[PDB]
Structure formats: C-alpha cells, structure tokens
Structure 1
Amino acid sequence: MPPIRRVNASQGSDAAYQILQEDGCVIVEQVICPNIIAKISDDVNRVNMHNRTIHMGDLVLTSKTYRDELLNLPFAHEVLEKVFKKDSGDYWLNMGNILNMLPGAEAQRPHRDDYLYPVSQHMDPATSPDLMINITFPLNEFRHDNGGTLLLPKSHTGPNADFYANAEDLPAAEMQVGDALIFTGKCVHGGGANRSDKPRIGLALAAQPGYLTPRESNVNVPRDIVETMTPLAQRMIGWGTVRTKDTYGLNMLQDKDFHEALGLKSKT
C-alpha cells in the first residue's frame, strides 16, 4: 500500500507536480497562509446535506477572500497549468464547495471523479488527458479519525473499474489548516468516516479543462462583484473565454473574446 506523499510548497510547484504525476495525489504543506483560510472560514461560517455532510457552494458571493486570494493562489495555478496546458489548454473551475463532514458521516466507496464526464470511459486512463484536478484546503485539522480524504495513491493509471478498493484499506490525507491535498480525477479516493466528536470542514476546488461544462455556473454573480476580480479568477468562474491546446476559443461572445464583447473590467 503506497503512502500519500508530501512536499512543502517552499520546494516548488514542480516537485508537487512530479509526485502528482507518479502517485495521482500529493499533499502540499504550508501552501496558503492560515489567516486567509480563517477569514474564508468566517465568511462560510456566518451562513445541502447527505451522509451527514453539508455541502455549500456560492463561494464567490459568500467570501471576498476566496474571490481574491484563494482563486488566485499562484502555487495552484502553476500546478494546474502543468496539468492542463499541453493536453487541454485553458482550465477553469468545475465547482468550488465547502464540505462540512459532521460526526457520524460515513466513508464513501472509493471512486474516480472523472467518471462525471462520460468520455472518460472511452479513453485509456494510462495515456488519456486528465479531466479533473481537485484541490482541498482543510478549514480545520484533517485526520484519519475525523474523515480526512482517503486516497489510493498510484491508482491513477489503471483501467476504469466497477470496484477499486474497500475504504477501510486506504490511507487518509492528514494535514493542517494551511496545507492542501491535490489529486487528479483519475485518483481513487473518497471521503472518510468522521468517527470523532467535532465536524471536519474542508474547502474543495475542482478544476477542469475549459472545454468541459462547469457543474456550477456563476451567471448569477453581479457584474459589479466580477469587475473586482482579476482576469484569471473571472475566467476561473466562467466569466471569460477559454482556449484549447489548438488555440480554439470557447465561451466567446459575439465572435469576440468574452471580456472584449462585454467590456468587462478586471483587477490586478
């Protein structure tokens, strides 16, 4: 049973990406200031449930720090561009979600996320493009006992299967506020059972190539809030054109670039 491997963010995004290529998962330690997560955690806190797990989206409206600091985190965009740029091109958010795993929440059947898109089932996982990257920021401490994400490392190249592993056999992502788990959509994984007394809160961001439809649309966000954000974070939440590896533009408006057609102001 391989371990979940780790690197400090000070060691560089390429180290984290090498482990992500070899294992399909990596824990990056100290990748974002804990105060950033603390603000975000208040925004979320001062505000939809299955298997004792509370899901909450709309983070663009809920939190200015998410909108500004998290969506722009350079380490994450370096790793993401390593993953998507040559095979797929521009990436953007599939969704961003808080997951509040209450006590009594039960571990899920280990699975691949990229099952969500049906094409993944007609491509060879050994040689196919990655369709999803997931970045999870603990909002409180992640341990095995409180349901920290279970991962089968090095499971990202084998064929699609109807069974991968029993959740009891798997290691847990154990990490602190300020760290992040990154796993690809071909990594076998699942939430763990929160067998503790306190909730286990994490902030999962799922990014995908720009040619795949986001699960969560941000068409309801006021343009005034969106002109607050950088061009990159606008693109992340779907307010921008996305180009494929072949420079083919999708999400264009009136034959022009999205920002150009709308006259959308940015920041930075």
Structure 2
Amino acid sequence: PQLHYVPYDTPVEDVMRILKESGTLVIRNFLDQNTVQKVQDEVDDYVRNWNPGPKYNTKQPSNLSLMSKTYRCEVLNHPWMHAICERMFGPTYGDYWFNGGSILHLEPGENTQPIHQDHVFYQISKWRRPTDPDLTINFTMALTEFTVENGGTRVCPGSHLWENGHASPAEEDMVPVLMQPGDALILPGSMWHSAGANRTSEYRRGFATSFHPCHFTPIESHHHLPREMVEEMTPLVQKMLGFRTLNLHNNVKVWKAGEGNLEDATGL
C-alpha cells in the first residue's frame, strides 16, 4: 500500500480498488480552482468579518451549504463523490447522505493534529471489522496548496486494514499529502490521519465534505435553511441534506413523513 495520486479520468473501479488496498488516495483536479475559490468567496461574503484598513475612518459561520451557493448547487453534486459513495455504502446500507462539511483554515503556528480515525465517534465502530464497509467517508478539497511546511494532511496507507484497538501509527510512518488547488484527498473513516504543523506565514485553506449511510444521524442538520435554498437544490442534494426520505438496502424507508415520503409532505 502507498499514497496514490490519480487523474480525474481514472475509472471508478480503479479508485475503489486503490481505496480498498491502500485506504486513501488523491484525485488530481477534482475541482477546478475557480470552484474552490468561489466557495471561499461566498463564505467570506456570508460571515462579512470586518477587515480594518490602514487607518481610521457580521455572522457566525454556519453550514457550508447555507453560506455557499456553489457548495450546495455544484460541490454537493460532484459525480466523483456520488460514484464512490454509491459503491461504498450502496450494497450494504442502500442510500447515503451528507454527514458534515467544514472550512479548513489552518492557522500559521498550529501544531500537529493528533493521529486519529474519523469513525471513532460511531459507537458501532467497536463492532465493525476492517473488511466491512466504512462508516463514513470524507473528501478534503485543497483551496491553497497542501505542502509539508504548511501542515498538509498526513495519512498512513494500509492502516485502514488494521484491527480495532490497534495502536496509532508512528509519527515517522505518516505520509504527507502534497496537493495543488482543486485536488481532493479521499479519507474513509477507517484511515488514520492527522494535520501537520503550519510552519509557514500563510494559511493552509480548504474544505471538506463527508457522507455516511442513510441509517446514521448526520453531524449536521440543515432544517434551519431557508425554503428558497432547498427548492433550488437538486433532488440529489435535497436527499443529501435531510429533506427527502431515504431507502435502506432492505427497501425499508427511514426519515419518512408518517408512512409516506418527507418531500411529498413538505411540498418539495
């Protein structure tokens, strides 16, 4: 197992094989630079933080899908995300949906993040085998370059196959993920990973998406979003963000409105 970097046109079956063998990979040019920049600009325009000028004469961050039209209209429809999620969660769990998504702004001077698996906050990971499907998957998209010096994510290829209770990987066995703007690192919930120290004078920036099986409760709820935004989402994204009924592998539906579909009861 190694850290693989693959082009955008890599066949899906290759990507899933690499995920199975090494537990992680990078898809180069996952997004164009303009798209990842657009999410940042829309986030900045939402929070409207005051930035002083040279001399004298605001909202708190919320869901990325609420702050960024590009995130909810373009990013969450990314075909690579759904191609992988369909194959990772589909055969066992049926539908999947959005787990959580955050802006990554690694501050200069931040030290090394502890090495961890993402599925630790699922109590059922204590029951899961390494051969089972993953409990969640994360897509980390680079806005700025990911370098060794600015604290880019580090992975340990193959550590997703380790048994439960296995010791953390050694610091020297971590592999830095070197990414250009628009690249994306695929992080299944079983991959041990950590952010490095930002020993530069500039921010390391990016954002994440994550998805997990329909029968698990997402980190984030989007129920507070204005109806106008929901109605402009694709049906796929409406399902991703908790506005539609989900189908289990046994065809039983969850997140229903009574015995019917949520979207029929809300008038979507």
Tell me whether the two structures share a fold, i.e. TM-score over 0.5: yes
Partner of 1:102: 107
SS at 1:134 equivalent: strand
Query: Alpha-carbon deviation of 1:176?
Result: 1.0
Partner of 1:172: 176
Aligned: 1:119 with 2:107: no
Partner of 1:144: 148
Partners in 1 of 2:196 and 2:239 — Cα distance?
32
In the superposition, relative to structure 1, how do residues 195 and 161 fare at CA in structure 2: closer, same or farther (>3 Å)? farther
Larger CA deviation: 15-24 vs 159-168:
159-168
Root-mean-square deviation (CA, aligned residues, Å) is: 1.5
5 Å-filtered alignment, 1:89-238, equals: 89-125=94-130, 127-161=131-165, 163-238=167-242
Partners in 2 of 1:223 and 1:30 — Cα distance?
33
Between the two proteins, the alignment pairs up a number of residues equal to 255
Whichever residue aligns with residue 7 of structure 2, its letter is: N
2:245–2:255 contact (8 Å) kept in structure 1: yes
Partners in 2 of 1:73 and 1:65 — Cα distance?
11
Query: Alpha-carbon deviation of 1:163?
Result: 3.0
2:22–2:158 contact (8 Å) kept in structure 1: yes
Partner of 2:68: 63
Aligned: 1:32 with 2:36: no
Whichever residue aligns with residue 200 of structure 2, its letter is: S
Partners in 2 of 1:163 and 1:57 — Cα distance?
35
Structure number, greater radius of gyration: 2
Whichever residue aligns with residue 235 of structure 1, its letter is: K
Query: Alpha-carbon deviation of 1:169?
Result: 3.1
Whichever residue aligns with residue 5 of structure 2, its letter is: R
Partners in 2 of 1:22 and 1:193 — Cα distance?
28
Partners in 1 of 2:110 and 2:245 — Cα distance?
39
Partner of 2:19: 20
5 Å-filtered alignment, 1:45-56, equals: 45-46=44-45, 47=47
SS at 1:128 equivalent: coil
State the Cα deviation string for residues 108-156 of structure 1 (Å, max 9, x = none): 221111111101112222x222101010101111112111111011111
Query: Alpha-carbon deviation of 1:105?
Result: 1.1
State the Cα deviation string for residues 242-261 of structure 1 (Å, max 9, x = none): 11111111111121111122
Whichever residue aligns with residue 174 of structure 1, its letter is: L
Query: Alpha-carbon deviation of 1:167?
Result: 3.2
TM superposition score normalised by structure 2: 0.91
Partners in 1 of 2:223 and 2:161 — Cα distance?
36
Larger CA deviation: 112-121 vs 6-15:
6-15
Whichever residue aligns with residue 195 of structure 2, its letter is: G
Detail structure 1 runs of 4+ shifted over 6 Å in the superposition.
Answer: none
Aligned-pair identity in percent equals 38
Unmatched segments (≥5 aa) in structure 2? 48-59
5 Å-filtered alignment, 1:70-89, equals: 70-89=75-94
Unmatched segments (≥5 aa) in structure 1? 48-54
